[PDB]
Amino acid sequence: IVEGSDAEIGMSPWQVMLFRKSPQELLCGASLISDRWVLTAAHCLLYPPWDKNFTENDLLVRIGKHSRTRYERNIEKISMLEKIYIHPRYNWRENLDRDIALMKLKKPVAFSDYIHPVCLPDRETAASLLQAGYKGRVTGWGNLKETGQPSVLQVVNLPIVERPVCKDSTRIRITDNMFCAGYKPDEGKRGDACEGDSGGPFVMKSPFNNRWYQMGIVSWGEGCDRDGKYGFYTHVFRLKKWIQKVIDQF
């Protein structure tokens, strides 16, 4: 996260770190949606152009974390993956359309002060909150700038951007399954995701029921925090049929 600030303790208790084994490194962010299901971006797991193709045994899920690099004994919980499910129409070739994957954990994770699931929106929550100008929040342990790494989890709040402005900021074809967010060059505030934040959550707090909803997944940007560019996020509500289908089936 570029131009964010340090998270408060327990501020994002759904945040998950995808941690690579051998060699020990941050793979990506993710989010806890139940005691056995973790949501992330497909390109964190499968992306042929960068030779990424991780299997269940390649990584661990670290939940309840604050420090990036420390083993947070008695706080964080580490889980093994039972199974990865990538959206079957994930378009890694063209535009990262449907950049979404689920992971089922071997064993349920115990909830605590530091570990708690986020809600997923329904159609009505999407319609209320996914409006240009409405702000959400992006968290992760990714890089502090484009070209270094934080000691603790970083947070930034960012406005949702009008769809024509999103499209006019990029050469890539933007689909209805994606939204963009970030400040415009004039605005006097900045901020963005950056390498290692992908797969993390864009959350909003419903003013109707005072719960946090994951509206987006950190997908991609052209660089990080560039003037006139925005971050592109997977629209979680638009892919919820698939999410419900995987969870109900498996």
């Binding site: 084994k21 020990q24 490194e25 661990l60 690099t69 083993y71």
Partner: peptide, 11 residues
């Protein structure tokens, strides 16, 4: 590595 070692049970 920059990362602190994890208990061996998780590996």
């Amino acid at each position: 590595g920059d990362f602190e070692e994890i208990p061996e049970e998780y590996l």
